[PDB]
Design a protein around this ligand. Sequence first.
Ligand SMILES: O[C@H]1[C@H](O)[C@@H](O)[C@H](O)[C@@H](O)[C@H]1O
Ligand SMILES: [Cl-]
Ligand SMILES: [Mg+2]
Ligand SMILES: [Mg+2]
Ligand SMILES: [Mg+2]
Ligand code: NA
Length: 287
Amino acid sequence: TGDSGQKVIGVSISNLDEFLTYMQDAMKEEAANYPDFEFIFSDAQNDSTQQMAQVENFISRNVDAIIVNPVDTTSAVDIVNMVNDAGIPIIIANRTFDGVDQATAFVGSESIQSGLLQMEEVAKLLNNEGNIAIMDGELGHEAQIMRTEGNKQIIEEHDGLEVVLQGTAKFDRSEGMRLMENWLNSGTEIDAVVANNDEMALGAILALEAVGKLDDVIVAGIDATPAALEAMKEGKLDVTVFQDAKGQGATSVKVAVQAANGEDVEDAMIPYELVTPENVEEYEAKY
Ligand SMILES: O[C@H]1[C@H](O)[C@@H](O)[C@H](O)[C@@H](O)[C@H]1O
Ligand SMILES: [Cl-]
Ligand SMILES: [Mg+2]
Ligand SMILES: [Mg+2]
Ligand SMILES: [Mg+2]
Ligand code: NA
């Protein structure tokens, strides 16, 4: 090696939402294993201009690697272009975008797989017959587009399955509750509420509980957060899909360190796993 300077990794997470908080905690835990590195853990607070300013700062500091969880798929491209031009490795964590193969590596999970797994199980529970209400996450996130696409690919496989409602609750619990309330007030018949993440599903459950209709509707989410697993244990949540926050966070740090140390790195695609009341205790154990 040509020097003995402390190395530095700059991290910009989109925000600290329910799932991403677990990922960030896992990044911080893994980062503690590398005493020859300093880490800068920054939070973009869902603001792409702030994320761009964080990345520009990392470039100007000449950090040894950058980890980004992109706020949106448009600015993601500008970020990767800029960091590539700077000659600094850039690891993309958890959120992908069109153009991701220009980054140094991607660490995350394949979104359409979670929508396919989720809706396959809901279809089984419905015996392939039912009116489906889909809760989109944050519009234009790849996870939103592709979880819903996976849902629809299963729905299109079965003539008795039909999407009757589709709206966004912005990956948010309170918005999920409001959306469910509005859907209930529309009088539309719903057999399953299928949400792009667990927070929205948990919001829908609160609304369904409030009018005594939770036993009449199948509810599904994605992430298998501890909150979701508790709802499943209580018999409120029928389906979720484990996304490995700890694995994504620890692996992103490991890959960034490798790249910072001058090694070529590669993607890490961590599988999604179906969670049902039959295997829920196995996923509690992951926390
Ligand atoms: O910020 C979102 C949010 O945490 C979702 O709940 C999770 O499924 C997505 O992977 C993540 O990008
Ligand atoms: Cl949240
Ligand atoms: Mg030297
Ligand atoms: Mg590559
Ligand atoms: Mg129910
Ligand atoms: Na159909």
